[PDB]
Design a protein around this ligand. Sequence first.
Ligand SMILES: O=c1ccn([C@@H]2O[C@H](COP(=O)(O)OP(=O)(O)O[C@H]3O[C@H](CO)[C@@H](O)[C@H](O)[C@H]3F)[C@@H](O)[C@H]2O)c(=O)[nH]1
Length: 541
Amino acid sequence: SLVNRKQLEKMANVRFRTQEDEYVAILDALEEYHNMSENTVVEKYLKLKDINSLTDIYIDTYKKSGRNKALKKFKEYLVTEVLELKNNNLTPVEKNLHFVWIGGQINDTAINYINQWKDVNSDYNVNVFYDSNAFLINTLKKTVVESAINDTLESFRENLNDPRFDYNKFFRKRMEIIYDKQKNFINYYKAQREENPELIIDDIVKTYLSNEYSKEIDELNTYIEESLNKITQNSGNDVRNFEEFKNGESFNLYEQELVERWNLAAASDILRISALKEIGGMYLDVDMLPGIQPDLFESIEKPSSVTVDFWEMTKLEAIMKYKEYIPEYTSEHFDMLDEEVQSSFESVLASKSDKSEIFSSLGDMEASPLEVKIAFNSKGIINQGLISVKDSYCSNLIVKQIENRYKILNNSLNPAISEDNDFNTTTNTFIDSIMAEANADNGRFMMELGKYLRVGFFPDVKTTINLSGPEAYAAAYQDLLMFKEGSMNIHLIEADLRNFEISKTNISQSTEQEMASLWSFDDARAKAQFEEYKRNYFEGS
Ligand SMILES: O=c1ccn([C@@H]2O[C@H](COP(=O)(O)OP(=O)(O)O[C@H]3O[C@H](CO)[C@@H](O)[C@H](O)[C@H]3F)[C@@H](O)[C@H]2O)c(=O)[nH]1
């Protein structure tokens, strides 16, 4: 399908101009590519990469050569050939569903979501990754942040009715206090981990909580017991036995997010891609649900006045209202429908007796050894769902993307922090360093890095996305299609990504749980929180 050698000598020549060694290198590599029946997909890709590099060498050596137009179209052909390679040679996806819940006890709602996948994919092995060393992180973060709420409001305990005490101001001051407490903990942690390098996270955490917040070690130990017991009874896989992950470059980043920043979503970001690289299968966030049988509601037309999203949520809410697969599932959106439409839902669902007629199964999936497939929503690609064969090329590209992004982050963050200054001063130093390194190829990314110290504690802070989330995936796909590594400026258009997207039929993303984020919160939510905190402080609690 890709042009052969003579087909390219035809594209590049003028009789008068000579054939240089830098051109013959291209010719030879192309000929070699067309004699690779003995080789694998990844080897074929690597050969296309060689070809592209040689072509770029020629174009950069003879800047105005008459060949350069032909060769520039040749490069387009190379990209096309990569996409053919991806699409025409697929291999079976390992039948594993990987979930992650780290930092604390797993909730019944998560289990109930997971159990639906179990119910309709009995041929799949299910893992729920947990960290047996770190059951107390969520308790630590909650204790600290609640103490901070209290100290803030006490500092403002006579301006509560002052309309100048905006939720914004509240979260700024609280952020100051959170930074101080959080650095206190981190320093204690590093010291203890110095005089005893094998102390586990939960030991240090529980003695910290005892010393500084009058918590009873006995109670925390009972909590640990109950969490271990619960996850063991629900397909748990201990991160502390995932040896390749522990021994790898990325484990320090996982523990940076887990222990220092208390961002379990980022830690899960770092773990999920390693699970796919080392094991293969499909990763799912615990607030995702199986796909709906495509023909189920084919008879119910969507009303003109409703968005596509709204309609999806109401599909699921109908399923749960009539079948009650998941208890206490909201009906907020379904209840807003015409009585006739609701009736239509009830009829269709009444005609069905078994869950297999509602939720579809994954079955025998296959994918390219080159690719990682990623879910998508109105907003763009989103790594709440992922599919990959073991050790796919893109899984390695993604691991590398994350590692480089954390290198850029920490080269500026760590010096700033080791100056033992307060939140605003540290922030200013760190931002100054990031700006000094910013340029045309990384601006967006660096701008988002400037907010890192606030993740999880302040409204509308989404740095994780650019560091360990979808932007690293997009960057990895661009790396693949540009025959390189280390892209920082994404120029792909949605059409480009569509080659790497998971079929919508394979996941139901518009779930109730999706709506509420565990690592981020928006302004309305921040305002509600502020008002409720004021009420609780007034009443003591
Ligand atoms: O206490 C906790 C709290 C959360 N987690 C993990 O974090 C995961 C993400 O939660 P969630 O839906 O809240 O994140 P989301 O809001 O969609 O953020 C996106 O972007 C995020 C970053 O890219 C990405 O993490 C996410 O997948 C995106 F869709 C959750 O499924 C667990 O694996 C945890 O392990 N322990």
